[PDB]
Ligand binder design. Structure first.
Ligand SMILES: NS(=O)(=O)c1c(F)c(F)c(S(=O)(=O)CCO)c(F)c1F
Ligand SMILES: [Zn+2]
Length: 257
């Protein structure tokens, strides 16, 4: 199957998923000088007060916290979005070293990791149908740099030993994703894609300018996860990021400056 290795990583994905070479692939480098300040963009409304986390799993690519998105709870709106997008899950991408790991880059700078909070447009009824639409998903991306710990991340870090290998899952209730957000909601936005197969061009990307800081111990715990299932040769889950893709005919818009 697809993965992040020499023989099945990003440079191979186009063979099963030809949209890999499409016109709106993600991630991209955000060239801050070239991004257009758009005074008509709205502040982003992030309304996470009633979020209900359910489960955390290791899917062999990342780990993901899934939410109960069966009611209009945790929702994203405003910004570049028309309508209401409901939070369904978050997951991360990270590196083998603190100098790489993010998917998006800023002026070619790579962060240690990137958090993706995945939301689907309610007009499409469910996440699966939304992923078939050009405005189906909105992913809020947040960079992680290594420095002081993020207290709101610790609950996640501490359960990872229970989901070490592909296929493992656990109950994971009462997790508040507000504890993963930076102070500022200033952002860049552009039309793009899923960053893993099937690479659907269904995402409005909203990438926050302000990174969150996590400690070296917290990110070390991410790197202790495994790509492999229990019983198979151990391959640490690190460098699960797709590199920047061609911007092609897109403009990245800034909510600030
Ligand atoms: N990294 S990303 O945020 O772009 C992203 C998603 F948010 C995403 F939802 C999918 S998915 O394929 O729709 C199922 C989730 O594992 C993805 F495949 C995917 F790549
Ligand atoms: Zn992602």
């Amino acid at each position: 199957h697809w993965g992040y290795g020499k023989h099945n990583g990003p440079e191979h994905w186009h063979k099963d998923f030809p949209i890999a070479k499409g016109e709106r692939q993600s991630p991209v480098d955000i060239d801050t000088h070239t991004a257009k300040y758009d005074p008509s963009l709205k502040p982003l409304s992030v309304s996470y007060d009633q979020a209900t986390s359910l489960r955390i799993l290791n899917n062999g690519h990342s780990f993901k916290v899934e939410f109960d998105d069966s009611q209009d709870k945790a929702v994203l709106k405003g910004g570049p979005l028309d309508g209401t997008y409901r939070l369904t899950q978050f997951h991360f991408h990270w590196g083998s070293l603190d100098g790489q790991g993010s998917e998006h880059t800023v002026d070619k700078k790579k962060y240690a990791a990137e958090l993706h909070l995945v939301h689907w447009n309610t007009k499409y009824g469910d996440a699966g149908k939304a992923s078939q639409q050009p405005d189906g998903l909105a992913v809020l991306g947040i960079f992680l740099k290594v420095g002081s710990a993020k207290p709101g991340l610790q609950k996640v870090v501490d359960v990872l030993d229970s989901i070490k290998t592909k296929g493992k899952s656990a109950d994971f209730t009462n997790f508040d994703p507000r504890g993963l957000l930076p102070e500022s909601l200033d952002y860049w936005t552009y039309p793009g894609s899923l960053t893993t197969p099937p690479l659907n061009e269904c995402v409005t990307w909203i990438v926050l300018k302000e990174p969150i800081s996590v400690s070296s111990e917290q990110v070390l715990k991410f790197r202790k996860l495994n790509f492999n299932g229990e019983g198979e040769p151990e391959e640490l889950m690190v460098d699960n990021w797709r590199p920047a893709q061609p911007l092609k005919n897109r403009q990245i818009k800034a909510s600030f400056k």
